Amino acid sequence: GTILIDLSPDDKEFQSVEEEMQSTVREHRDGGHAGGIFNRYNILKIQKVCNKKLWERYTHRRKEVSEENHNHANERMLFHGSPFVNAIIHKGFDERHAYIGGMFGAGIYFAENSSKSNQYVYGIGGGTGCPVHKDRSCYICHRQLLFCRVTLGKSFLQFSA
Amino acid sequence: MAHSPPGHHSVTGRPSVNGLALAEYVIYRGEQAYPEYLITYQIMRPE
Numbered sequence: 001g002t003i004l005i006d007l008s009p010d011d012k013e014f015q016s017v018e019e020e021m022q023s024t025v026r027e028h029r030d031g032g033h034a035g036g037i038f039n040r041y042n043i044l045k046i047q048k049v050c051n052k053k054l055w056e057r058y059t060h061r062r063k064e065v066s067e068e069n070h071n072h073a074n075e076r077m078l079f080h081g082s083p084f085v086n087a088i089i090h091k092g093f094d095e096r097h098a099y100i101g102g103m104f105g106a107g108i109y110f111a112e113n114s115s116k117s118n119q120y121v122y123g124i125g126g127g128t129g130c131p132v133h134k135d136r137s138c139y140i141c142h143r144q145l146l147f148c149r150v151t152l153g154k155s156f157l158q159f160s161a
Numbered sequence: 162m163a164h165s166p167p168g169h170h171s172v173t174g175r176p177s178v179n180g181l182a183l184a185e186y187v188i189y190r191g192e193q194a195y196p197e198y199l200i201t202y203q204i205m206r207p208e
């Protein structure tokens with residue numbers, strides 16, 4: 001059911017998504033070990049992910065959450081990096097996409113910083129880096145991130161390092 | 162997957178040491194996210 005629509009770099013939608021990606025790069029405490037050393041990206045393509053069934057699944061749950069939270073979904077746009085981005089775009093998010101060992105328990109993790117999600121593109125801790133060169137700081141190989149619509153509802157605030 | 166804390170739909174991990182970090186978030190139901198954009202990119206070597 002999934003189709004991917006290329007956005008033109010001249011489209012305001014491409015531009016606003018690129019700006020979110022670039023502007024939320026930060027330095028990481030690992031000195032770049034997991035995600036590589038960089039201050040910015042070269043954006044090669046942005047595609048809209050269109051799947052009617054997955055969208056209806058999302059909006060159904062959004063309404064449930066909203067009705068439990070004074071008509072407030074608390075919807076955000078957040079990054080997700082994963083080795084399974086191709087499965088996610090076809091089948092949606094589920095338990096197979098959870099970070100079992102994450103700091104806040106076994107769930108599906110999203111970031112405001114695009115560079116945080118970039119650390120997970122090749123697996124936990126960057127895994128072994130890119131398939132071709134085994135380099136977590138590869139400047140050649142093409143990477144993919146998702147920019148996702150996420151319903152937080154009533155969110156439990158955890159202060160942490 | 163775990164459950165959310167009772168009475169909550171998600172967890173917000175607020176950064177409390179690194180003053181430059183933004184928040185991270187966890188959901189426990191796959192239906193609470195839709196992957197709207199697929200972005201293909203390279204990281205760029207700093208000059």
Ligand SMILES: O=c1[nH]c(-c2ccc3n[nH]cc3c2)nc2ccccc12
Pocket residue numbers: 079080081082083097098099100109110111116117118120124185186
């Ligand atoms: O984008 C993220 N992906 C992941 C991620 C994605 C898929 C995984 N499979 N197994 C571990 C995973 C972690 N973790 C994060 C943690 C904090 C902030 C963002 C992310």
Ligand SMILES: [Zn+2]
Pocket residue numbers: 130131132133134135138139140141
């Ligand atoms: Zn490579």
